[PDB]
From Swiss-Prot:
PROSITE patterns: ABC_TRANSPORTER_1, ABC_TRANSPORTER_2. The keyword Nucleus does not apply. PANTHER family: ABC TRANSPORTER DOMAIN-CONTAINING PROTEIN-RELATED, ATP-BINDING CASSETTE TRANSPORTER SUBFAMILY A ABCA. A lipid is attached at residues 1, 21, 967-968 (S-palmitoyl cysteine). The keyword DNA damage does not apply. This is Phospholipid-transporting ATPase ABCA1. It comes from Homo sapiens. Phosphorylation on Ser-1665 regulates phospholipid efflux. Palmitoylated by ZDHHC8. Palmitoylation is essential for localization to the plasma membrane. Changing residue 311 to E: 85-90% reduction in phospholipid and cholesterol efflux but no effect on localization to cell membrane. ATPase activity is decreased by cholesterol and ceramide. ATPase activity is stimulated by phosphatidylcholine and to a lesser degree by phosphatidylserine and sphingomyelin. Phospholipid translocase activity is highly reduced by berylium fluoride and aluminum flouride and reduced by N-ethylmaleimide.
Length: 1818
């Protein structure tokens, strides 16, 4: 029915709104978490990087110069964008224009040409002709020695005192001047000017010396004596011109000098960036211990310079690196010597330095003076040969140094320096300085690194002695056989030992949680390049192959990795896609906690029972709660969608799918709320535990997704028991579809199936947890109230159960319901109102909002609802509070009145009331009575109560039920007439009155007497009128004569007719309290067994997590390093097809061995041989699409790609790269073999194909969603290097040999060794064939395994037909050696998250027993125990001490248990007194300390069972904060060691320091010898003492703060109940077993109220409370509410006990809220108040037959009694007051008798004013 659902929604939203506290937090919490997440996002901006290619790295197998260039130049993996020249499929290489390479090539070619230029022989022959044809013909400035055939004046001239000229007349201080002039002025054609201007001594001698030069022609054209000599001169001219052409074309020495002077250009040279630029230009293209102090400061400067630390640490292991060696057999020694010789090819400088030193004097002597030197002097000075020089030098291309060469410096003298200073002297000094610098730089580099040592232990110790010396590179270990130089194993496996800090960790084969990226960081990620491991592997494999096969080198291995495409990374986005369920379910867990609080609060107030009683079937109210909870949850889902769609958080989101998924999850979580709400009662505790349980439900998703083991039906069956796991699966699928936007439909279907199953389970568990009634005959006539009483058995419960108790047919009675319907309840339920004991407040929904809501639910709007206000106008007049204080909670007192008024809504015609009045009796009860009388005196009413005073005052027909069967029924006087005890007369000596009353009338008798009163019983049935009329007058006369004060009259109250018809004391109290605690510990299984067991399982789970977890410091793994990891395939490209060696390699690859070592029986252990896959050339069919064959061939074969990758800048920011839209190039042919489909990329561009294939495979993985990881790890491409290389090695060696033959061959081992080393170095660069290897650092150890496999293939192809390639093979491992002291200590003090988690779990487990103590203390603290002991004279200090002692006992016992569970483990419990006793005392002190800390919590908290969870959460938070504080360091540690007051945090810190100290001790003892460290050694004692002292302070403060209901012990047996209640106090000593029995003797129930386990309904609880009230004899006993509660017969028995206790005499004090009992028991005297302070006597008279006679009865009542009042009057019955109440009862009684016996009347009774009305008047 829609209106009732609408009203339910209205009330739910009123609950959500009016409190105005929960709703604000509800709205803000999702907002708060979103603000935090946005802060995190803006703290982690996306990082976008372009695709990058990596420059090729050269291994030692390649040229040594490329190797050095690679280690120095591309040591950073720069990420050049475009494909580098080395990435091309053809010839590899990057350092083509490098200056060093140009220098080396120029030097080699010039050396080859110089000895083959046909020059040396040419000048040798020219000199021989000079010394043969012209012989000694020397023309020096003053020495013209000429030996010719006298052709051109072939005569000798000498320079003596006199000028000698043996030609003609000499003619002869006019002689030295011309000598000096000739010494100075001699040139090509200056003779005529010389002799024409030779000072002033001409004329006399000028003729001879000016005519001789004419004949001599200054040797201009003279050199033409013979044709052969002229030809020799011409060929020498040509040869030297060509030599000059070459030495100018090289042009690299000038550049070398340029950078050399640039380094030292100025004194204060700038080395910030110019030095680095110059270095990079020279080597590549534009894009501690003290051995020698010079080297020490050089390397200090090198490492201290900016932007050089990485290169410094890459170079240091190479120039002071050291190699170790295990084997010692002659063959493996030969292999190691081959490695040594391969390395030593670079050791060519020391010999170069020695040769420079040796040859500098020779070169200097040759230059200073030589016949050829003079020949070249005179050759470059002429008129004709100079033109030949000019045309030759500028012949090929050009020469700009012609003039400089012509006029170069000569040893004769210095010409000039004003213009420029650049001469051969400068070149000589510069080269000498450079050679010296080279010597000084190189001598710091150790040459030899050769040391063979047999035993591995010695290898490890020497490695230690080297690492601690800062001098070590690596070591190699083989597995050989007995000493033998031949028959070396054909399948050799080896391991490499080297520092962990310079190698990739061998523990993991992958990166774990894969993330997109190139991962090419050399500082810490790519450790195989700068650590030298790859170089070690290359050299060892090269030596092995060379020794085995014996062939030459002819092989160059290079390294490259795939260019990872352009991408934008958001690790934050990955974290969101992984764990946004956590945040959204945090919002929803707070929401469900709020909803759980609301629903459990509604249930606890018993409002569900009220709703069930009146209409409101379970299904419809459940649906109303359903919708009310959905509304806010759907709003939260909608705002979550809005926020995620916008703000650049989760774009590419389809609103429909996300919204429907969120809605279904909202429905499911609301259902989970309904499930977890089905077994809870306490509101706040229920909300907290619902939050905790939902959080626990969420946890296992992480482990399920991480392990993902045996995926299949297991996932669905497990999700059928858990919603958040299914939601997380759906979220991961949505994140998957985001990138390219098990089955979602199947997940939703099983989610709905789970929803329905959970709903039906909830229903099952919820199910499992004139009225006439014909039964042995109740009749409730229309009109007037109808009471209902009963004591034995149900009596009342059965009636409510049958009428509305979910027991429609019956409850075990006759099958007759009543109301002549018996079938349909809805109509009467609309017409029926029920007011049970529990009230209806509905939180702060005003006070009258309940009225309108109930009226609308039952009645209708408009007219009907209007009635409420007018009836409200009669209900209570409180308009000021109505308009001001609407809430009912602050309106205290009328809550019962409000409930009964709400019962009078709609049809208030068959209303039923159960104990309508309960509280402050007088005013509230009178108001309820007036309300009932003035509202519903129209039709049937049912009323049930136990006070039995409401029944008498109310005008109603009482009904008495004893055992279901009716006992009596009718009006008060009606039933009293036939079943009423005598007529009570009270007065306030005794024998005188006794004989005055008894003798006058025999029927009178005594019943009971107590001080200051006397009661008598006069039966009225037998004879009343005569006795009274003759008795009271004389009673009053005697009272006047005697000392009696007054008297009064009472009738048979309803209860009796009901019953008949139906210092050592301190130790004593301490031991008593300890006995209580021991007894409660023994019993109360649910409160202590769990507390003792679940800490044990928590410690056990901590133990298993700490044990099963693999060690975190175990780096070495002995990985066998196979080229497979799980399953994959690679590619082999036959680039540069020339059929020169490459075919051999490829056919060796394509054999039974395949790639590596899969021979014999499959030597690799894990992968097994698994020989499968037909060796076949084949490919899968290509798709048709758009005829890609020629579509992709449209002028696009080598350089361009079939498609492009769109920039992922802003339109799409996906982690992968833009998909081209096609499958790249057509799939090349594949090779099926060795269980992996190899690929071939012959004649392919490679780089683009690699990127596109990577994109395709990652897309396929995203489709299948196998936790996407990189598949292809690399490959290799064969081919041939550049053919531009200079002639082969043999040519260079032969040229060096002929050079040795020339230039005074020296057999000493100084020049021959140098030239041999230089030849070997030059020949090393030769590479007949070369290969390139593709790798990727993402797959760890791929580099090493690929080197292994490629070198194995090279070995296989190099076999000389000896046998099958299968037997030949190689293997390579890596194994970091045992760590040293420093890093072992450092890792022993690591974060050790295992230690943190175990400490947190153990402290969390142990922080519970104090919680048990606190909950026990608080539950006994609520006005039950504390004040009880106060009344007992406890001096609470001793009680606190006893509780303290018991708490520590009941902690140490769990302490012993938990230490036993640790004893189950071994390491944590060491045998001696260093680890076990410290831990035991640690736990004992933690118990001693934590429990006093939380004692104050037992004061502020007002409700038990929630302090448990509250303190648990606080302890968890404190432990977590301590753990993170421990993790703050990873900057003052002292501040950490200052927060002692947090004992839990301190104890956790002590646990972790103990663990780390034990680890340090064990590792130190294992590694070497050390002193035993004690746990307390200068650390433990101080902190334990300070912790104990702080506990003392906390105990003191809590005690001083302490200084500045019924007490029933729960889960306690009747025996022990009474036992302690006897031992409570009273100094029983040995009477302990008596006084308690004495107590029972007053209260009886030796067995019925005793031996009973637990506690029973309030009756026995109050019985025991009153029994324990009178522990002994006190002067007074105060009783507040002596019997309030369920009182079938407890009233009479308790009253008898109280009046007996008064009989012994205790002056009991009563201040109960039940007036009738208090003033019927207590005596100032009640009789005096009700006689003198009361109103007139109440008269009730009964009339039969016809009512008319009511007219005269009142008439004379107003005549004889002018002062009279009437309060009640209906057909045939009426009531009178007569306020006068004078002349004693005698006169009025007699006159009424003599009148009404005459008129018609038959029955009457006169009573004293209602015993409570006297106070009501006040």
């Amino acid at each position: 029915c829609w209106p009732q659902l609408r009203l339910l929604l209205w009330k739910n939203l009123t609950f959500r709104r009016r409190q105005t506290c929960q709703l604000l937090l509800e709205v803000a919490w999702p907002l708060f978490i979103f603000l935090i997440l946005i802060s995190v996002r803006l703290s982690y901006p996306p990082y976008e990087q372009h695709e990058c290619h990596f420059p090729n790295k050269a291994m030692p197998s390649a040229g040594t110069l490329p190797w050095v260039q690679g280690i120095i130049c591309n040591a950073n993996n720069p990420c050049f964008r475009y494909p580098t020249p080395g990435e091309a499929p053809g010839v590899v290489g990057n350092f083509n224009k490098s200056i060093v390479a140009r220098l080396f090539s120029d030097a080699r070619r010039l050396l080859l040409y110089s000895q083959k230029d046909t020059s040396m022989k040419d000048m040798r022959k020219v000199l021989r002709t000079l010394q043969q044809i012209k012989k000694s013909s020397s023309n020096l400035k003053l020495q013209d020695f000429l030996v010719d055939n006298e052709t051109f004046s072939g005569f000798l001239y000498h320079n003596l005192s006199l000028p000698k000229s043996t030609v003609d007349k000499m003619l002869r201080s006019k002689s030295e001047e011309m000598i000096q002039l000739g010494d100075q002025e001699v040139s090509e054609l200056c003779g005529l000017p010389r002799e024409k201007l030779a000072a002033a001594e001409r004329v006399l001698r000028s003729n001879m010396d000016i005519l001789k030069p004419i004949l001599r022609t200054l040797n201009s054209t003279s050199p033409f004596p013979s044709k052969e000599l002229a030809e020799a001169t011409k060929t020498l001219l040509h040869s030297l011109g060509t030599l000059a052409q070459e030495l100018f074309s090289m042009r690299s020495w000038s550049d070398m000098r340029q950078e050399v002077m640039f380094l030292t250009n100025v004194n204060s040279s700038s080395s910030s960036t110019q030095i680095y630029q110059a270095v990079s230009r020279i080597v590549c293209g534009h894009p501690d211990n003290s051995t020698t102090p010079y080297c020490n400061d050089l390397m200090k400067n090198l490492e201290s310079s900016p932007l050089s630390r990485i290169i410094w640490k890459a170079l240091k292991p190479l120039l002071v690196g050291k190699i170790l060696y295990t084997p010692d057999t002659p063959a493996t020694r030969q292999v190691m010597a081959e490695v040594n010789k391969t390395f030593q090819e670079l050791a060519v400088f020391h010999d170069l330095e020695g040769m420079w030193e040796e040859l500098s004097p020779k070169i200097w002597t040759f230059m200073e003076n030589s016949q050829e030197m003079d020949l070249v002097r005179m050759l470059l000075d002429s008129r004709d040969n100079d033109h030949f020089w000019e045309q030759q030098l500028d012949g090929l291309d050009w020469t700009a140094q012609d003039i400089v060469a012509f006029l170069a410096k000569h040893p004769e003298d210095v010409q000039s320096s004003n213009g420029s200073v650049y001469t051969w002297r400068e070149a000589f000094n510069e080269t000498n300085q450079a050679i010296r610098t080279i010597s000084r730089f190189m001598e710091c580099v150790n040459l030899n690194k050769l040391e063979p040592i047999a035993t591995e232990v010695w290898l490890i110790n020497k490695s230690m002695e080297l690492l601690d010396e800062r001098k070590f590179w690596a070591g190699i270990v083989f597995t050989g056989i007995t000493p033998g130089s031949i028959e070396l194993p054909h399948h050799v496996k080896y391991k490499i030992r080297m520092d962990i800090d310079n190698v990739e960790r061998t523990n993991k084969i992958k990166d774990g949680y894969w993330d997109p990226g190139p991962r090419a960081d050399p500082f810490e990620d790519m450790r195989y390049v700068w650590g030298g491991f790859a170089y070690l592997q290359d050299v060892v494999e090269q030596a092995i192959i060379r020794v085995l096969t014996g062939t030459e080198k002819k092989t160059g291995v290079y390294m490259q990795q795939m260019p990872y495409p352009c991408y934008v990374d958001d690790i934050f986005l990955r974290v969101m896609s992984r764990s946004m369920p956590l945040f959204m379910t945090l919002a929803w867990i707070y929401s469900v906690a709020v909803i759980i609080k609301g629903i459990v609060y509604e249930k606890e107030a018993r409002l569900k029972e009220t709703m069930r009683i009146m209409g409101l079937d379970n299904s419809i109210l459940w649906f109303s709660w359903f919708i009310s909870s959905l509304i806010p949850l759907l709003v939260s889902a909608g705002l979550l969608v809005v926020i995620l769609k916008l703000g650049n958080l989760l774009p590419y989101s389809d609103p429909s799918v996300v919204f429907v998924f969120l809605s279904v999850f909202a429905v499911v979580t609301i259902l989970q709320c309904f499930l977890i709400s089905t077994l809870f009662s306490r509101a706040n505790l229920a909300a907290a535990c619902g939050g905790i349980i939902y959080f626990t439900l969420y946890l296992p998703y992480v482990l399920c997704v991480a392990w993902q083991d045996y995926v299949g039906f297991t996932l669905k069956i497990f999700a059928s028991l858990l919603s958040p796991v299914a939601f997380g699966f759906g979220c991961e699928y949505f994140a998957l579809f985001e990138e390219q936007g098990f089955n979602l439909t199947t997940s939703v279907s099983m989610m709905l199936f789970d929803t329905f199953l959970y709903g039906v389970m909830t229903w099952y568990i919820e199910a499992v947890f004139n009225l006439v009634k014909v039964y042995r005959a109740l009749n409730f006539y229309e009109g007037q109230i109808t009471s209902f009483l009963g004591h034995n058995g149900a009596g009342k419960t059965t009636t409510m159960s049958i009428l509305t108790g979910l027991f429609p047919p019956t409850s075990g009675t006759a099958y007759i319901l009543g109301k002549d319907i018996r079938s349909e309840m809805s109509t009467i339920r609309q017409n029926l109102g029920v007011c049970p004991q529990h009230n209806v407040l509905f939180d702060m929904l005003t006070v009258e909002e309940h009225i309108w809501f109930y009226a609308r639910l039952k009645g209708l709007s408009e007219k009907h609802v209007k009635a409420e206000m007018e009836q409200m106008a009669l209900d209570v007049g409180l308009p000021s509070s109505k308009l001001k204080s609407k809430t009912s909670q602050l309106s205290g007192g009328m809550q019962r009145k409000l409930s009964v008024a709400l019962a009078f809504v709609g049809g208030s015609k068959v209303v039923i009331l159960d104990e309508p009045t309960a509280g402050v009796d007088p005013y509230s009860r009178r108001g309820i009575w007036e309300l009932l009388l003035k509202y519903r005196q129209g039709r049937t009413i049912i009323l049930s109560t136990h006070h039995m005073d409401e029944a008498d005052v109310l005008g109603d027909r009482i009904a008495i039920i004893s055992h279901g069967k009716l006992c009596c029924v009718g009006s008060s006087l009606f039933l009293k007439n036939q079943l009423g005890t005598g007529y009570y007369l009270t007065l306030v000596d005794v024998s005188a009155i006794s004989n005055l009353i008894r003798k006058h009338v025999s029927e009178a008798r005594l019943v009971e007497d107590i001080g200051h009163e006397l009661t008598y019983v006069l039966p009225y049935e037998a004879a009343k009128e005569g006795a009274f009329v003759e008795l009271f007058h004389e009673i009053d006369d005697r009272l006047s004569d005697l000392g009696i004060s007054s008297y009064g009259i009472s009738e048979t109250t309803l209860e009796e007719i009901f019953l008949k018809v139906a210092w050592k004391l301190t130790q004593q109290q301490f031991v008593a309290l300890l006995w209580k605690r021991l007894l409660i510990a023994r019993r109360s299984r649910k409160g202590f067994f769990a507390q003792i067991v679940l800490p044990a399982v928590f410690v056990c789970i901590a133990l298993v997590f700490s044990l099963i977890v693999p060690p975190f410091g175990k780096y070495p793994s002995l990985e066998l390093q196979p080229w497979m990891y799980n399953e994959q395939y690679t590619f082999v490209s036959n680039d540069a097809p020339e059929d020169t060696g490459t075919l051999e390699l490829l056919n060796a690859l394509t054999k039974d061995p395949g790639f590596g070592t899969r021979c014999m029986e499959g030597n690799p252990i894990p992968d097994t041989p698994c020989q499968a896959g037909e060796e076949e050339w084949t490919t899968a069919p290509v798709p048709q699409t758009i005829m890609d064959l020629f579509q992709n061939g449209n002028w696009t074969m080598q350089n361009p790609s079939p498609a492009c990758q769109c920039s992922s800048d802003k339109i799409k920011k996906m982690l992968p790269v833009c998909p081209p839209g096609a499958g790249g190039l057509p799939p090349p042919q594949r090779k099926q073999n060795t269980a992996d489909i190899l690929q071939d990329l012959t004649g392919r561009n490679i780089s683009d194909y690699l990127v596109k294939t990577y994109v395709q495979i990652i897309a396929k993985s995203l489709k299948n969603k196998i936790w996407v990881n990189e598949f292809r790890y690399g490959g290799f491409s064969l081919g041939v290097s550049n053919t531009q290389a200079l002639p082969p090695s043999q040519e260079v060696n032969d040229a060096i040999k002929q050079m040795k033959k020339h230039l005074k061959l020296a057999k000493d081992s100084s020049a021959d060794r140098f030239l041999n080393s230089l030849g070997r170095f030059m020949t090393g660069l030769d590479t007949k064939n070369n290969v390139k290897v593709w790798f990727n650092n993402k797959g760890w150890h791929a580099i090493s395994s690929f080197l292994n496999v490629i070198n194995n293939a090279i070995l296989r192809a190099n076999l000389q037909k000896g046998e099958n390639p299968s037997h030949y093979g190689i293997t390579a491992f890596n194994h970091p050696l045992n760590l040293t002291k420093q890093q072992l200590s450092e890792v022993a003090l690591m974060t050790t998250s295992v230690d943190v988690l175990v400490s947190i779990c153990v402290i969390f487990a142990m922080s519970f027993v104090p919680a048990s103590f606190v909950v026990f203390l608080i539950q006994e603290r609520v006005s039950k125990a504390k004040h009880l002991q106060f009344i007992s004279g406890v001096k609470p200090v001793i009680y606190w001490l006893s509780n303290f002692v018991w708490d520590m006992c009941n902690y140490v016992v769990p302490a012993t248990l938990v230490i036993i569970i640790f004893i189950c483990f071994q390491q944590k419990s060491y045998v001696s007194s260093t680890n076990l006793p410290v831990l035991a005392l640690l736990l004992l002190l933690y118990g001693w300390s934590i429990t006093p800390l939380m004692y104050p919590a037992s004061f502020v908290f007002k409700i038990p069972s929630t302090a448990y969870v509250v303190l648990t959460s606080v302890n968890l938070f404190i432990g977590i904060n301590g753990s993170v504080a421990t993790f703050v360091l990873e900057d003052i540690l002292k501040s950490v060691f200052l927060i002692f007051p947090h004992f839990c945090l301190g104890r956790g810190l002590i646990d972790m320091v103990k663990n780390q100290a034990m680890a340090d001790a064990l590792e130190r003892f294992g590694e070497n010898r050390f002193v035993s460290p004690l746990s307390w050694d200068l650390v433990g004692r101080n902190l334990f003492a300070m912790a104990v002292e702080g506990v003392v302070f906390f105990l003191i403060t809590v005690l001083i703060q302490y200084r500045f209901f019924d007490a029933i012990t729960e889960l306690l047996t009747g025996r022990e109940h009474v036992e302690f209640f006897a031992l409570l106090r009273g100094v029983p000593e040995k009477e302990v077993g008596k006084v308690g029995e004495w107590a029972i003797r007053k209260l009886g129930l030796v067995k019925y109220g005793e031996k009973y386990a637990g506690n029973y309904s309030g009756g026995n609880k109050r019985k025991l409370s009153t029994a324990m009230a009178l522990i002994g004899g006190p002067p007074v006993v105060f009783l507040d509410e002596p019997t309030t509660g369920m009182d079938p017969k407890a009233r009479r028995f308790l009253w008898n006990c109280a009046l007996s206790v008064v009989k012994e005499g205790r002056s009991v004090v009563l201040t109960s809220h039940s007036m009738e009992e208090c003033e019927a028991l207590c005596t100032g005297s009640v009789q005096h108040l009700k006689n003198r302070f009361g109103d007139g006597y109440t008269i009730v008279v009964r009339i039969a037959g016809s009512n008319p006679d009511l007219k005269p009865v009142q008439d004379f009542f107003g005549l004889a009694f002018p002062g009279s009042v009437l309060k009640e009057k209906h057909r045939n019955m009426l009531q009178y007051q007569l306020p006068s109440s004078l002349s004693s009862l005698a006169r009025i009684f007699s006159i009424l008798s003599q009148s009404k016996k005459r008129l018609h009347i038959e029955d009457y009774s006169v009573s004293q004013t209602t015993l409570d009305q006297v106070f009501v008047n006040f």
